[PDB]
């Protein structure tokens, strides 16, 4: 059976309970935590590729008023579906499947200023997905993988002070 599991999941927890915020840059930034899955039920012998992307979580926006979120006007149009490819790709089932699945490296950005980033909106909610597809599959093969716990809002700042300090804390 394949199986994609969270880790660090308590850890995104402590986050998504203040509601998780990711500051977008022109440059593009890193994220904190940052999204790391365990898998098995793969092939080992067959080759895959991981993908990153995020799915609008809301149909409206967001604001920080009064110490906590709220609705904040009607959702923009959506940021271009942006799909970050694990650099590690493609890959050995044994090679995904020995270690955790750690995506360090992705930045998310509010500017198309290149460098592979993915694009988010402002104060709009976004949950992290997983694909995974095999290399020479004819069928072209997709899985979905959706992690709740991982949800946050982007922003151009932190706007909730127990964000910025958990940040600190824990990064
Ligand atoms: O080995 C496959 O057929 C495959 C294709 C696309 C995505 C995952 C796959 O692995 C598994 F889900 F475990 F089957």
Same mark, same amino acid.
């Given at each position: 059976?394949?199986?994609?599991?969270?880790?660090?999941?308590?850890?995104?927890?402590?986050?998504?309970?203040?509601?998780?915020?990711?500051? *977008?840059?022109?440059?593009?930034? %890193?994220?904190?935590? #940052?999204?790391?899955?365990? !898998?098995? $039920?793969?092939? +080992?012998?067959?080759?895959?590729?991981?993908?990153?992307?995020? *799915?609008?979580?809301?149909?409206? %926006?967001?604001?920080? #008023?009064?110490?906590?979120? !709220?609705? $904040?006007?009607? +959702?923009?149009?959506?940021?271009?579906?942006?799909?970050?490819?694990?650099?590690?790709?493609?890959?050995?089932?044994?090679?995904?499947?020995?270690?955790? !699945?750690?995506?360090?490296?992705?930045?998310?950005?509010?500017?198309?200023?290149?460098?592979?980033?993915?694009?988010?909106?402002?104060?709009?909610?976004?949950?992290?997905?997983?694909?995974?597809?095999?290399?020479?599959?004819?069928?072209?093969?997709?899985?979905?993988?959706?992690?709740?716990?991982?949800?946050?809002?982007?922003?151009?700042?932190?706007?909730?002070?127990?964000?910025?300090?958990?940040?600190?804390?824990?990064?």
């Amino acid at each position: 059976e394949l199986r994609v599991g969270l880790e660090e999941s308590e850890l995104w927890l402590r986050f998504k309970e203040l509601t998780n915020e990711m500051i *977008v840059t022109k440059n593009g930034r %890193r994220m904190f935590p #940052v999204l790391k899955v365990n !898998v098995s $039920g793969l092939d +080992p012998n067959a080759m895959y590729s991981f993908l990153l992307d995020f *799915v609008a979580a809301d149909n409206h %926006r967001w604001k920080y #008023v009064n110490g906590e979120w !709220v609705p $904040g006007g009607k +959702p923009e149009p959506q940021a271009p579906s942006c799909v970050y490819i694990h650099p590690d790709s493609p890959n050995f089932g044994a090679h995904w499947m020995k270690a955790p !699945v750690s995506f360090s490296k992705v930045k998310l950005t509010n500017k198309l200023n290149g460098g592979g980033q993915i694009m988010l909106n402002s104060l709009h909610k976004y949950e992290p997905r997983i694909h995974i597809v095999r290399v020479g599959d004819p069928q072209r093969m997709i899985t979905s993988h959706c992690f709740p716990e991982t949800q946050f809002i982007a922003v151009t700042a932190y706007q909730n002070e127990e964000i910025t300090a958990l940040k600190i804390k824990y990064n």
